[PDB]
Structures are given as C-alpha cells and as structure tokens.
Amino acid sequence: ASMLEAKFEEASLFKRIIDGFKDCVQLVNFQCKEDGIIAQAVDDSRVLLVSLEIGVEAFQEYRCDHPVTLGMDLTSLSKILRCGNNTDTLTLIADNTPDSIILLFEDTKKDRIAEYSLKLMDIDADFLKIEELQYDSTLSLPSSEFSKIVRDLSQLSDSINIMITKETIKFVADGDIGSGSVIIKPFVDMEHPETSIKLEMDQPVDLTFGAKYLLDIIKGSSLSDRVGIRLSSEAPALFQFDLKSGFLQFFLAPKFN
Amino acid sequence: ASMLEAKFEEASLFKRIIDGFKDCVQLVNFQCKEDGIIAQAVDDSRVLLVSLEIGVEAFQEYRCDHPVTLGMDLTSLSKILRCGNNTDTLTLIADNTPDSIILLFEDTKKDRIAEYSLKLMDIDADFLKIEELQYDSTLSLPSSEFSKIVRDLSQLSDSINIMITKETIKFVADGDIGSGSVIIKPFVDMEHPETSIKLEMDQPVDLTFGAKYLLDIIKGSSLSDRVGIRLSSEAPALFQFDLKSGFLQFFLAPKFND
Amino acid sequence: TLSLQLPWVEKYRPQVLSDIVGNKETIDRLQQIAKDGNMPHMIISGMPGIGKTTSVHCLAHELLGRSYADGVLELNASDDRGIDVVRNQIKHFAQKKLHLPPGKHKIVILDEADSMTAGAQQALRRTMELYSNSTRFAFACNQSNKIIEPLQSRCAILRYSKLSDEDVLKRLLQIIKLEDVKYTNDGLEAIIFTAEGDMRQAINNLQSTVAGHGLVNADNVFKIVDSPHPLIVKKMLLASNLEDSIQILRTDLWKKGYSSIDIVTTSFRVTKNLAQVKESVRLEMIKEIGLTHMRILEGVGTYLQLASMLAKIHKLNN
Amino acid sequence: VVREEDKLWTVKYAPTNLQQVCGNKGSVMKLKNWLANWENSKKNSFKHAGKDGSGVFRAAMLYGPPGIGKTTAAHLVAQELGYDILEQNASDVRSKTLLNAGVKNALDNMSVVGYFKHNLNGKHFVIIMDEVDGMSGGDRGGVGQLAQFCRKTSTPLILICNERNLPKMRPFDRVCLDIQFRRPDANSIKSRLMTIAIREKFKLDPNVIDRLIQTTRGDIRQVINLLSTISTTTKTINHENINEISKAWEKNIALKPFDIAHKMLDGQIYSDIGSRNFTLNDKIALYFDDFDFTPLMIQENYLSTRPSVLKPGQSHLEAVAEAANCISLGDIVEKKIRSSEQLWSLLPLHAVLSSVYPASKVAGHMAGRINFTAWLGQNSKSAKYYRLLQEIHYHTRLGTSTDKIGLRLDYLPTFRKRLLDPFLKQGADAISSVIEVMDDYYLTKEDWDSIMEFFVGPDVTTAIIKKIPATVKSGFTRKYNSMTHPVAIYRT
Amino acid sequence: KRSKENLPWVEKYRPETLDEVYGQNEVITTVRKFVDEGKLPHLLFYGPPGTGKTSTIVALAREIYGKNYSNMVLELNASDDRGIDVVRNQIKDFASTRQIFSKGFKLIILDEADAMTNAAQNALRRVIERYTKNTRFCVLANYAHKLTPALLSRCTRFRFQPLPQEAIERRIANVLVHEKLKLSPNAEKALIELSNGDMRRVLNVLQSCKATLDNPDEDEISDDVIYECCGAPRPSDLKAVLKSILEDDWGTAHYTLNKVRSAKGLALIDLIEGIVKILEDYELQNEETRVHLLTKLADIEYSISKGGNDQIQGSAVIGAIKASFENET
DNA sequence: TTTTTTCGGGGGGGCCCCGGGG
DNA sequence: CCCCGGGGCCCCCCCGGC
Numbered sequence A: 001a002s003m004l005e006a007k008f009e010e011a012s013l014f015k016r017i018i019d020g021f022k023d024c025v026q027l028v029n030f031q032c033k034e035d036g037i038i039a040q041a042v043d044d045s046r047v048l049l050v051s052l053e054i055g056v057e058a059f060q061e062y063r064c065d066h067p068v069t070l071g072m073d074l075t076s077l078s079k080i081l082r083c084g085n086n087t088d089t090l091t092l093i094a095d096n097t098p099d100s101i102i103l104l105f106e107d108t109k110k111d112r113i114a115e116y117s118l119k120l121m122d123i124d125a126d127f128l129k130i131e132e133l134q135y136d137s138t139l140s141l142p143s144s145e146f147s148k149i150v151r152d153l154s155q156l157s158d159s160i161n162i163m164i165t166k167e168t169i170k171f172v173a174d175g176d177i178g179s180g181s182v183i184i185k186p187f188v189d190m191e192h193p194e195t196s197i198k199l200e201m202d203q204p205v206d207l208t209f210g211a212k213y214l215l216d217i218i219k220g221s222s223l224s225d226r227v228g229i230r231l232s233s234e235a236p237a238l239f240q241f242d243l244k245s246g247f248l249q250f251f252l253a254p255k256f257n
Numbered sequence B: 001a002s003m004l005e006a007k008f009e010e011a012s013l014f015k016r017i018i019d020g021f022k023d024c025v026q027l028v029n030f031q032c033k034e035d036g037i038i039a040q041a042v043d044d045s046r047v048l049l050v051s052l053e054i055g056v057e058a059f060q061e062y063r064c065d066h067p068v069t070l071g072m073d074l075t076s077l078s079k080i081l082r083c084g085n086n087t088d089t090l091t092l093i094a095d096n097t098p099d100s101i102i103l104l105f106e107d108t109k110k111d112r113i114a115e116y117s118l119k120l121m122d123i124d125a126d127f128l129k130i131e132e133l134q135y136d137s138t139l140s141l142p143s144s145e146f147s148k149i150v151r152d153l154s155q156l157s158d159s160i161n162i163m164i165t166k167e168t169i170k171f172v173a174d175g176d177i178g179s180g181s182v183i184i185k186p187f188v189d190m191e192h193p194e195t196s197i198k199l200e201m202d203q204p205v206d207l208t209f210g211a212k213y214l215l216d217i218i219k220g221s222s223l224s225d226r227v228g229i230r231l232s233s234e235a236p237a238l239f240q241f242d243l244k245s246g247f248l249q250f251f252l253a254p255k256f257n258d
Numbered sequence C: 001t002l003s004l005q006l007p008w009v010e011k012y013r014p015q016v017l018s019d020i021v022g023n024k025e026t027i028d029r030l031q032q033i034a035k036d037g038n039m040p041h042m043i044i045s046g047m048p049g050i051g052k053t054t055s056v057h058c059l060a061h062e063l064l065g066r067s068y069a070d071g072v073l074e075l076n077a078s079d080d081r082g083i084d085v086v087r088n089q090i091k092h093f094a095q096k097k098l099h100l101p102p103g104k105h106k107i108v109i110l111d112e113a114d115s116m117t118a119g120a121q122q123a124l125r126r127t128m129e130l131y132s133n134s135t136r137f138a139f140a141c142n143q144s145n146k147i148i149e150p151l152q153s154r155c156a157i158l159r160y161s162k163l164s165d166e167d168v169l170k171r172l173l174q175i176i177k178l179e180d181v182k183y184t185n186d187g188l189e190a191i192i193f194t195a196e197g198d199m200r201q202a203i204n205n206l207q208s209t210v211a212g213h214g215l216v217n218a219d220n221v222f223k224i225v226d227s228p229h230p231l232i233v234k235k236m237l238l239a240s241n242l243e244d245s246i247q248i249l250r251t252d253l254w255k256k257g258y259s260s261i262d263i264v265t266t267s268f269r270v271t272k273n274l275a276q277v278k279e280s281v282r283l284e285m286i287k288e289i290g291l292t293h294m295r296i297l298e299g300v301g302t303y304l305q306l307a308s309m310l311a312k313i314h315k316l317n318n
Numbered sequence D: 001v002v003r004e005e006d007k008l009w010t011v012k013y014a015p016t017n018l019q020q021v022c023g024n025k026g027s028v029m030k031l032k033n034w035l036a037n038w039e040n041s042k043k044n045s046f047k048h049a050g051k052d053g054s055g056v057f058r059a060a061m062l063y064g065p066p067g068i069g070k071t072t073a074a075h076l077v078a079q080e081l082g083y084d085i086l087e088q089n090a091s092d093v094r095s096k097t098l099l100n101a102g103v104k105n106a107l108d109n110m111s112v113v114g115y116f117k118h119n120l121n122g123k124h125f126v127i128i129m130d131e132v133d134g135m136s137g138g139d140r141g142g143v144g145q146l147a148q149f150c151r152k153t154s155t156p157l158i159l160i161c162n163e164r165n166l167p168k169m170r171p172f173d174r175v176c177l178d179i180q181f182r183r184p185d186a187n188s189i190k191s192r193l194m195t196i197a198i199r200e201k202f203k204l205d206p207n208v209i210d211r212l213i214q215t216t217r218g219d220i221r222q223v224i225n226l227l228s229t230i231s232t233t234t235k236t237i238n239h240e241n242i243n244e245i246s247k248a249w250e251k252n253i254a255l256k257p258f259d260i261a262h263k264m265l266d267g268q269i270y271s272d273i274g275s276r277n278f279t280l281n282d283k284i285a286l287y288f289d290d291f292d293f294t295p296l297m298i299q300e301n302y303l304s305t306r307p308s309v310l311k312p313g314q315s316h317l318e319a320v321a322e323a324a325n326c327i328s329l330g331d332i333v334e335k336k337i338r339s340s341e342q343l344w345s346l347l348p349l350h351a352v353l354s355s356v357y358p359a360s361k362v363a364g365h366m367a368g369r370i371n372f373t374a375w376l377g378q379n380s381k382s383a384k385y386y387r388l389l390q391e392i393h394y395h396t397r398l399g400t401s402t403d404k405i406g407l408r409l410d411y412l413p414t415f416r417k418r419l420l421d422p423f424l425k426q427g428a429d430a431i432s433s434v435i436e437v438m439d440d441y442y443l444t445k446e447d448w449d450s451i452m453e454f455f456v457g458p459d460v461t462t463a464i465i466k467k468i469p470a471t472v473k474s475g476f477t478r479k480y481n482s483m484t485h486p487v488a489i490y491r492t
Numbered sequence E: 001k002r003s004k005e006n007l008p009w010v011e012k013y014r015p016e017t018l019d020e021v022y023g024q025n026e027v028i029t030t031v032r033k034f035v036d037e038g039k040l041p042h043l044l045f046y047g048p049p050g051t052g053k054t055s056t057i058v059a060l061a062r063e064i065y066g067k068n069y070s071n072m073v074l075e076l077n078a079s080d081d082r083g084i085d086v087v088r089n090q091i092k093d094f095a096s097t098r099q100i101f102s103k104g105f106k107l108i109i110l111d112e113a114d115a116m117t118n119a120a121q122n123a124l125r126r127v128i129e130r131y132t133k134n135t136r137f138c139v140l141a142n143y144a145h146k147l148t149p150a151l152l153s154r155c156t157r158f159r160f161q162p163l164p165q166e167a168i169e170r171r172i173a174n175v176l177v178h179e180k181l182k183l184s185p186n187a188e189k190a191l192i193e194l195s196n197g198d199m200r201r202v203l204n205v206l207q208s209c210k211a212t213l214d215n216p217d218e219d220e221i222s223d224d225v226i227y228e229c230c231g232a233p234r235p236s237d238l239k240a241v242l243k244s245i246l247e248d249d250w251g252t253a254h255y256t257l258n259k260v261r262s263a264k265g266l267a268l269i270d271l272i273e274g275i276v277k278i279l280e281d282y283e284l285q286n287e288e289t290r291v292h293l294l295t296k297l298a299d300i301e302y303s304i305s306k307g308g309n310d311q312i313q314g315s316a317v318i319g320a321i322k323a324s325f326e327n328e329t
Numbered sequence F: 001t002t003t004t005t006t007c008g009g010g011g012g013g014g015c016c017c018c019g020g021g022g
Numbered sequence G: 001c002c003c004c005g006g007g008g009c010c011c012c013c014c015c016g017g018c
C-alpha cells in the first residue's frame, strides 16, 4: 500500500460514479496520475466514448507517486462495491506493478474492516487523445428536463434528430407509433436559476443520434444537475455532466448524413 | 386422535419453523414425546444436518401419551401447511401406530374448520445424539450481520473460510474475479445490548465451508435475532438460532484440506 | 482402521517430466519446452493409463512454479464447461493480468476435452488467437476426432503411443525397489501381460497382489487378476473343431460369470480386429454375431444361442 | 513489451500486407474490388450491376477450408482500403435479442474512434461476422437476423465461415457475394516456409514442403505449428525423417456423404492387398462419419458401378441381389435401433449390414456420378399425398363405407368418371352435375384438385386438365363460389 | 415391518457380516486384508445376479464403520437419479467434505453403475482421482460392456464367480437348521442343479417347498416336492422323451411327448433345455449332427420366446432331432 | 453434388413470479 | 406501495459406437 493510496470522503460517491456509466461500457482503463484519476472507455458498439475525471478536491486524502494504469471490469467492480456500506470510508490501494487493486471499506463507528481485492484485466486499448473541439452550438439545460424529453421520446422512435438554431432546440422522434417533436427555448428565471435554459449558437446545426445510446447516457443523470450538450458539424455530441471535482463526459457519435 | 394433540400459538410459528430448513433436507423425522417435538434431518450430500428442538412452552396445549415417531416429506408438509391463513390455529393430531398425521386449522372468529391428513413414511431413523464436543471456540453475533457477510462473500467465490484467533474473526473468500476479507472483533455495548459480538476462545482455529450450505443456514435468521457459531478443529461446526422456546441447529462438516 | 493410505498410482505419480516412462520423443520435447518456454497450444491424445494428464501437470508445474496457483486454470468433465463458462470464465482468465517470468505464460488445461459440446469448442477458437501472448491452451483427450478441426488446426498434435513391456517393467521395478517388494520374474511378466500396457492397471494389480498374498509370482498374480477375456474370445473363435470352441466358451466364459451380452460384444470386436481371417469370412461371422446379439437383446440369452453362433461360425470357416 | 522470442510462430511470422497472403490471389482481389466500390454501389442504390456482378450484393461471404487465411484476408482488406473494423466472433453472444440490441444499432452510425483517431472511409465501419457457421441456434440464434442485416446494412458487412454447404446457412443463399477461398498450393507456401526456416535456424529441404503440406491438408497454420514443434529437438528436416513426422501429424478429416459413398464403393479397399491398408475398422469408422446419410447413399449408388470383386461364375445381377438382401436386413436392424427400446449398441452392426457388406459385393469402379439420396423427397411426397388423402377421406366419411386405402384404390377411379369426364365430354353444361356430385360427398374445390392429383399411370390428369378449355374451368369455379355448399366437419 | 420372520427368505437370510458370505473366499480374504492393513483401493465387483456383491459391500462398510454406516456412506443405485448434475454436485460435495459423525474416510457405493450414462461415468473420473486421499469408490456391475474404459482402468477388479455347490450346500444346511426343515439328498442335488449358481433361486425354491409340505415339522422335502413347486420336468421324463424321439417312429414319439407333457403340464422350453443338456454329454461321430441340433434348437427356442403354436413347436423339435441324428450313420 | 423417423439425457434460451429492498 | 434480483419451470434443439 505504497504507490497509490486514495480515500473517498464518502464511499457512496464512488458507487454512484461507477453506476453512472456501468451500463454504457464493459471494461475501463483508470489511469491514476499524480494529479487525479482519468478514465476512458469505448462501448462494444464502438460508437459511444466515455471520459471520466476525478480531481484531488473530491478526495479526502490522495497520494500517488508514479502514474499507474489499472484495467478493470465494471461488473466485478460493481459486485465488490455493492458488498460495502454506503455510510463507510472507501480506500483504493495500488502497489508496484499492480496485478490487482485493493478496495478497503473502513468505518469509525465500528471497527469492522473489509479488504476486498479485484484482479486487473490486461486492457489493450490506446488512450484516444480527446482533442478540444470548438462545437458550433452549446446548450445547457437542467438534467430533469433533458431526462423528461428523452424518456418521452424513447417510446416514439429508436432514432432522435436534434436541431439547434436561434433560441430554438428541436427534438424529433419518428418511429413506428408516429412522429413526435419537442421544442424548447432559452429562459432565465431568478426564482430557479438552476433550471434556466441557456443557448449559445453561431451556426444552426442538425444531427441524428440513436435513442438507445441517449437513454443509456441519461441513465447517469442523477450524478449531476444540468447537461452541457455541445454540437458541431460532424462531431459526436459532448454530453457533459459535471461532478464535485472533475466531470463525466459522453461523446455520442452522430448518425450518417 | 388419542396419542398426540398439539395446538400451536399460531400456524405462523410452525410455518416459520418449516421454512427454515425445507430447502436443506427433503425427508424429516419428528419424535414427539411428553416434553416436546425433536427432529433430525440429514442432507442428501451428507454435509448438513438440521436439528429442531421445539419446546412444550411453544404450544397453547400439548398432549402426548407415548413417544411417537413420524417420518414425513418436507415438500408435502410445506405444501399442506401453505393451505392455511395467518390468523388461524393449527393443531397436529396423531393416533395409535400412526399411518398419517392430521393437520387441523381452526378460526374461531370466522368459525372456519379445515382438515388435512398427510400419510407418514416408513423411515427407520436412528436419531443420533448431538454429542456436544468441547468446541475450540464459540461466538455469538447478530444474525443480520452474518447474513450480510455470507451473502457478500458468496458472490466472490463458492467457499468461505472462517479463522478464529485472539479476539479476531476473519471471513475470507478467494474466487476468480478477486478475493475478499471481513474482519470483526468482539464489541460490547450497553445502549443497545441486542446487538453485540461475543467471543470465547481456547485454541485458534481455521475452517473452510461451502458457500451453498452457508447460504441456506442463514435462512433461519428470520427465526431469531442472534446466531451462535461454535467451531472446533476438523470437527462439525454448529450454527444455533435460539427460538422463543426451542432452538434450530445446523451441523456443517468442514471441507477437506489436502 | 479408518485411516487409508495413498495408493501407489497416486503416491508414485511422476512429479517431474523425467520420471514419465514411454514416448521418449514427446517427453523429451516437453522437457525442452519447459526449459525454454514459448509453450504452444497442444492436444495430447492416446489410450487410457499412459500419462497424458501427468505429463500436462508436470509441464505446467515446471514451467510456472510459484505462479502455478494464479497462472493455471484447470477444468475437467467434473466441472461445468458450457458455452457460458467458455465465454465468461475462460475469457476473464485470458484477459486477467499476471506478471510472469520472461518466457512463461498462463495455462488453461481442459482435461477430457472430448466431452465438450461443439458450441463450446467453437466459442473456444478466437480466445486462443487474440490472447496467445498471455495464455496457452493444453487439451488432453482419448478420442482425438471429437475435437473440431478448427481447434485442431490451432494446436500441436501429440499422439501418445501404447506403452511397451520394457517401460512398464522399468516403472514397476522402480516402485518395487522404493517399497521393498518380494517378487518373481514370472509374477512381473504376468502383471505386465494382464495390464495390457495400462500403467495404472499394472500398479493397481501389483499393489493388490502384494497386499493380499505377499510374494508377486505368477500364481498369486493370476489368482486375483484374470486373463483378458478378449484373448479368450479370440481363442474360442479361432478354434478348428467346434468341440474345442464350445469347451472354451463353456469352461472359460460361461461358468466364470461372464454375461452373454459381454461375450457377444467381445466376439464382435475381436472378429472386427481379426486380421488373420479374410475380410469376407469376417463379414459373415459379423453377420452371425449380430443376429445372435439381436436375439440376446430381446431377452433370449442362453448358452444355447452362443453354441449355435459358434456352430454357424465354424460352418462359415469350414 | 512482448518479447518476440515468446510469441507463437503463427502470430510472429504472420502476414502483415495483403500481398503476403499466399494463394487465393483471385479471391483477395475480388474481395478488394467488391469492397472498394461499395460507396459507388451506395450511390447507385445497389440497383445497377457490374462487370463481375458484385455491385448488387450488399455483403461479402468469405468462405473456405480451415486455416487458409480467411480472417487474415478480411482484416487486411479492411485495413488497407481504409475502414474501421467492428468484428464479432463466436465468443460473443450473437443471438437475435443481442443482435437487435447490439450490432444493429451500429450498422448506420458514425465511428467515434474513427473521428477521434484523425480518408473518407477511415471513419466508416466494416462489420466482420466471423465464424457464422459456429453460431449454435436454430430459432433463437438470429441467423435470419444476420441475413436481414446483410439485406439492410448501410456499411460493408463481411461474413466469414468454414463450410458454406450447410442447412443452417441457407438464409445466405443469394443475399451475399459468395467468395471462395481454396486450399493454397505448395508453390506459394514454399517461400514462406523457407523464410521461416532461415529465420529460426533449422533445416528444411525443398523436397519436404509438398509432403508436409499434404500431411495437414493444406493448412498453413498447421504446417507452421508442425515446424515450430519439430524444431524444438530436431533441427534437421530431411527426407530421412519425413515419414515419421507425417505419420505422427497426419490429419484425419471426416469424409462427407459423396466422398464417403465414393470411397466405400471402390474395389481397391476390398482387395486382399488393399484390405490391409484399409481395414474393416477403417470402413466401420467411415460409416460413422455420417451415420444418417451413409446407408441411404449406399442404397442409392450400389446399382451404378462396374464391379471388380465378383467371384468366378457370379454375375452383376446376383451381386446386386445379395447386396439388396443385406440392405433389407440392415433396414430391419435400423428399425430395431430407432424404437422405444433405444438400442443404439447395435449401430456398429448396422454399419456392416447397411453400408460395408452390400458395398463389398458390388465394389468396383463408378459407371457414372454419385447421386444424392432420392428417398427423402419421395418420403416427403408420400407424406403430403397421405395427408391429402386423409383429408379427402374424412371429408367423405359420412357418405362412404371404407378406409383411406379403399378410397384411394376403389372410390377415386369412379369419382374421376363422375367429376372430370363430364367436362371432357360434355363441357360447361356438365358443371351442374359435377357441383351436385361434390355436394353429395361434402367435397371442396381444393379436395377436387387433390383427388385429381392422385392418379398414376395412364390416368395422369395433368395434361388432360391443362387441355380443358379455360372458359369451362372459369365457369366451374365461378358457379361453385356463387353457390352455398354444405360442411362435413364443423370445427368450432 | 413387524419382524424379520415376516420377510422373504431372500431378505431374511442376507449375510450380515463378511463371515456369512460363502463361495467368494478369495475376494472376501483380499478385501478383509485391505481393511485390516488399511489399503482399500477403488473396487469394482463384477458378477452375475445373486452372487453376493451388494451383501459383500454392505458387510465391508459395516465392518469399517459401526452400526451407523448408513449415515457415513453415499450409496446410489439405479432407483436414484445419477445424471451428470448429481455427479457434479452431490458426489463432489460428499467426497470433498468431512464426516459429520465420525472422523474417518468416506465410501461411495455406485451400485448398478452399468445403468449410468456415459457422461456421468466420464465426469466421475477426475472426481475419483482427485479426492483419492480421503475418498474411495466401489462400483458393482453385472455387465462390463456398459462401463467406460476409463472407469474400468481406474478401479481394481474383483470377479464374483457363480456360487459353487459346496457353499450352496452349507447355506442350505444353515437355512434348514434355522427353519427346522429336512431335505433329502436327491432333493438337495436337484435344488443345486436348478440353482444355476444363484442363491436367491435356492432360497425362493426352499420357501416354496416348505409351503408345499402339509406339516413342515415332520415331513421331508423330496425331489417330488421340488419338481411340483417348480413345475419342472423329471429327469426320467426327459430321458424317456429323448429315447422315444431317437429310437421310435413318429407316432410313438409324438404320443410319448404329449403324454409326458400332459402328465404334469410340463413346458416345452424346459424339455428342450433338458434335452440339450443331455445331448451335451453325447459323443457324436459327426460335427454336422451337433451343428444342426444346436442351430435348429436355438431357432425353436427363439420361436417359443415369442409364443406361437406349441404343438407345431414340439413336432419341429422331434423332427429336428431326428434329422440331425440321421447324419450319424 | 443435396438433405427422415423415437425415449432419455443433457444443454441453453426464454420467460414467470416470489421475495426483498427502497 | 412499486421496482429489481434471482431462484424456479417451460420450451426447444441436439446426440446416441470404439
């Protein structure tokens, strides 16, 4: 327990973060640097990419000397995490050339300590450098409204087309039960600023995505409170959900023209 | 209806007793005396032994002229016992040289009477005294905590190792995805005495048990609030749940280590 | 007495590749692989009691060592090996990260692989190709035709051959020296003859003879162990006079407790492998034996039917 | 990090460029031409044809024997022309439910990895469905779903399999381009084997490659594994040791129905010299290669050979008669085997009675081609006609006193004269009489057709019915439909 | 289940200890020595019906253990499902787990293993081999062709021969002493002859004979009682039938056969079997005679097994015998 | 150069619904 | 009071010798 010693202030945070993107990807690469933890994972469909950053601020006590890449299977990680207690201290331990990681569930009210070990998987997947992209349109709206709209449109069509233009956001779902369109516009309310809808558009754009991927993306909306949608000409939409220290970003690729 | 007439406080009691070990053994043999009912059942694998010792004080009335042995099938007994309500009184009736046991359900408030007779099975049982070995270690812990520990460690692997040492209890489980360990120490409390871990140790011990049998030995946690585990080296391990009147004991044979 | 002692077949199981007798080329090659590394995917085929599982285990042990616990996944017929097992547990083991010495890899030992469904074998194809840099696969089978050709193309074939008399004699003498057994050369010859090249059977027969009567001689060896009944059937079917064949069937098979079904099946097999007799005569004898077998399978099994079968065979061979 | 010395020779000395693949050059070029012009076909909506007729098929179906370079060729073509590969293998669940929730949602989606990696097709998808034949599912395996994808895919879908001629893959009959990869010849593989020999420091004479290749049935992977294993202790591969190596590593593939029939009906394996090389055990095992089709093939192909194993004075007719007698005995044994008793222990005997013995009497040289069993289709036809006869019989049970056999043999000849002859002789005016007769026996129009389909010999009605004037038949049908008719069985 | 006096003689006289098993001296001595020194291997008792395999293994288990062997052994038979799931789970847990009651090794008795499927036998291989340190397997069989070669190679084979005459006489004497019965020497000889090495047949026939006697206290079981209760032919009857068939005309032979059969309702199959046994001793000068006799009599036996016309069958027997012996000139 | 019958066992996919948690 | 995990049947698909 020398190289990597990290301690969550609350164990529930790690469980929620993992559950946020548990159904999106199968295997993950947690690269623990000296500055925090960064993870990149591509689903089996090879169409949705997931980035995750956790900073030192969220961590009560973090000590990592050398950078270590840990390949993990999210199913086993979820199994071990479920074996812990929500009102508990979770500690991640990694040692020299870790073939496995140690998850330590430790509490102060009682003296019960549970030390689980998870075997790491040799993940052969190069880190896809996520070059900064200046998306044409930026839409930020409360997670509740995004979830409501997408869930309502889920029963309509398997593919949803999103068009962004002047103070206007259209979500159209044309499936086997008909065609349904939802139109939203920006608004600023001092009573509920957190629910305010903000749109920043330079050139209107239109892109069609898959309903299932959007549903799986929103499934993790409980972690954050708003959405950070960014849309460009031919680039995946950046569904960014910001957490305490760091973020969780989805890069849902678009449908063919 | 001469030898045995035993009416329970409520049918729910006998139901709960039966559900505690109906998924472990198939054929049971009760031996009803003037002191109560005692049953011993051995699993098909010959790895788990269930012993029930219901007491006389668990019945509104209990009459038994002579010691009478009844061999029965747990599936059929449970199926018949599921044919009653939770607000009725269940009485067991047995006659001379029993060929069947009669289960009578009565509801005075609704004036409801239901009859059910189950044919007994000729089992030449040799009920074996549970010789209380000088167990190397004994402990008592809340049943919910034991259930949580076993259910967590079952997923990791199919075996659970219990190590008893100087004020320390180690539940370890090594599997395929990874390994897990839970360490608990004797904790005494006075604000809520119901929950506490007590340990009386003479020699240190270490025993491995199958997860499948432990997962069924914990279904009796609904029958009590605390569980007592007695462990001895290369000897059967005792898991006891104390009922309102009697007790339910599971004897589990430790696995071979070669 | 309630404390048994380990049988010699287990107490004297070879723990090194140099202690395995027979198949000198294959054993030497496995030793060279163990000393060098780069173990290839292999399928070891042969008859029972020759040392396939022993060789596989010895190779894995000598190759890994302290990493044997975490670098070996042994699955056999006693363990579930369905499609789900292949697609989850084996895949996880192959993907699992383990730091091994420079020239060592993880090992998956699928013992008795001939009892695996075609679907599981098909699902076992790509896992061996996309994870060959970390894990290697060793199969041990009796029938090599039960493994699908795509998998056979992915592994090196090691067809172990029947053990000879010299190898069995060498191993038996070594065990005798290590146990100080009083023996006669005739006893060892009888043990080898009755073992039919199966080392397990030879060792078991020797242990039984020593533990029952002591001195290992022809008389004591044959008192417990009976001569192979296939040879008796061959002798009965190759007799000149019907009287001699009937006498062999009577005093050597019927009164020894051998069932009629066993006798007819053994006769069918022996006639199938009776190279001395011409193919046509063998086919007619097989027809008669099949008629007798069909008669017996319907409940009419008696010495009279076997005598009639022998008479018909003699008429065919006249 | 992986030291090359610890890598398998198959992956170490593996093809790296599409040209490095030996043999089957035409197949590789055909695949490259098909996949390169995929976008052009998309622009044409896959309606126009091409020079090689590859512009209409939307998917590729690479196939061939094992260990020839199918998956390697597919991956090399996908990587060379420029595409992103989404490969699915037998280790992944390819059921219908997973397919709908899996690859289906990616057939018409962009490549996130393709864009974030950096060619117009570099960001496009190439779905390779390897080991199609290995999918164990008849109703829940989603093979028809794979065919649907091939029909409705927005990206090049390449399917790879080892054996095309199987019923399971009948859905892919004509919805895909059938590219054939064959066993590579020794000429091309000699260069690779010599290169590996020079690299790995062991001797391999030029005369040994052809024999080694024949040992493995042209499986380059198997030959490389052979070389790697033999080089462990013996560094010399010369003519002095070819026999032992080839005998120890001889490949044993199960012959297929046609090959089994051809081998079994040969007079060289039954000779006093050939019987030693090919023993009775070999023939009995050959029977078990396909124990459901071998007896039928033997029974179908035992009358089309010139024998060479006839005894002095025996003629062909006597030999075929003896073979037929033993075939009948084997049929009786087969009836015994597949019964309530489940007597499978008799299977070896059946092999001798139905396949080996009858062939041994008419063995020789084929006087034609090995024809497939005709009994299966005849049995299907018999079942169809029997069901039709049963329906007709139970439609007329209320006006007749007989069984179905009696109806076929006795009543139908007279019913024809009362139902069809009036049309031939009278014409349209007879429509009323035929309608009446069909009404007296609760006979439907479909029943009329089925009855007319039963007659054989000089009573065949196909040409006679086809010759009837169209007006009479049209009036008959219209009058029947315009009239109300009774019902025999009132299915409630 | 009142007492042992209300049980069939086959079960009332089941050997309790290993000293009550007769006719298997070699196997009994070997297994007793193995139990003494503690060198019990994996055993395979192969033998015909009613030779003392199940009794021998039960006695061995009771000798190793006490009277609580029932809970300390895993005995599985054809009446219980023994599929691959059973082998994988129940047998594996029993072999890999310690004894609840005692602190000794464990015994698994797979009686009637010939009825097990090939998959279960294949799965049993490594289960047997791995837990050999604390577990031993015993397999009881009547037919060996149903056992996989691997299982046969993994077990030490002991063959239970058909019970010789001497052991049968000793056990008959024991039963007579216990039941207070008298058996004539010729009755004993007939009983052993009809036994065919099976003690169950002997016990059942002896019980039937005791039933036949008016007062079993003083009356003696003569051969007449044996033939009456078994309804079997009398040796004099078989000899007379053969003599009439071989030395008289067709009418005389037919009349003699019909009279002998109608005297006590003798079955044709029993007469054919007895005549075959008698002719076995005959020294024929021509092989063709014996060949024809055997083939035709086997055909007649097969025809009788399916019923048919009995008079035609008897006439066929007579004609076949006459035609076969016509070649002895 | 193509394509069938029956019990029993085993495997593998599909729901269904009780129980338990929130 | 409502949702999710995971035991239990139900249905179908394929083998069967040495």
Ligand SMILES: Nc1ncnc2c1ncn2[C@@H]1O[C@H](COP(=O)(O)OP(=O)(O)OP(O)(O)=S)[C@@H](O)[C@H]1O
Pocket: C008, C009, C010, C012, C013, C014, C019, C020, C021, C022, C046, C047, C048, C049, C050, C051, C052, C053, C054, C055, C141, C142, C171, C199, C200, E150, E153
């Ligand atoms: N070549 C051998 N040299 C020495 N002992 C052998 C040899 N072969 C078999 N034995 C002995 O017999 C015992 C069993 O050998 P096994 O390895 O189990 O044979 P096997 O070929 O694997 O059996 P099968 O084919 O799975 S039925 C070993 O523990 C050895 O004691």
Ligand SMILES: Nc1ncnc2c1ncn2[C@@H]1O[C@H](COP(=O)(O)OP(=O)(O)OP(O)(O)=S)[C@@H](O)[C@H]1O
Pocket: C150, C153, D009, D010, D011, D013, D014, D015, D020, D021, D022, D023, D065, D066, D067, D068, D069, D070, D071, D072, D073, D161, D162, D184, D192, D220, D221
């Ligand atoms: N034409 C070839 N030239 C050189 N090597 C080949 C060739 N074909 C196969 N190999 C070698 O065998 C190895 C595996 O070939 P694959 O393409 O994977 O087999 P395949 O043709 O797809 O047949 P299956 O369905 O996998 S059995 C390659 O990595 C090569 O090393």
Ligand SMILES: Nc1ncnc2c1ncn2[C@@H]1O[C@H](COP(=O)(O)OP(=O)(O)OP(O)(O)=S)[C@@H](O)[C@H]1O
Pocket: E009, E010, E011, E013, E014, E015, E020, E021, E022, E023, E024, E047, E048, E049, E050, E051, E052, E053, E054, E055, E056, E141, E142, E171, E199, E200, E203
């Ligand atoms: N050696 C024997 N000595 C005395 N009685 C015997 C002997 N063998 C068989 N019997 C008698 O026949 C009865 C049956 O004996 P068993 O050994 O149990 O039969 P079994 O050999 O198991 O039959 P199979 O082989 O399964 S058909 C015993 O109860 C005895 O009464």
Ligand SMILES: [Mg+2]
Pocket: C052, C053, C111
């Ligand atoms: Mg083995």
Ligand SMILES: [Mg+2]
Pocket: D070, D071, D072, D130, D160
């Ligand atoms: Mg391939």
Ligand SMILES: [Mg+2]
Pocket: E053, E054, E111, E112, E140
């Ligand atoms: Mg028995």
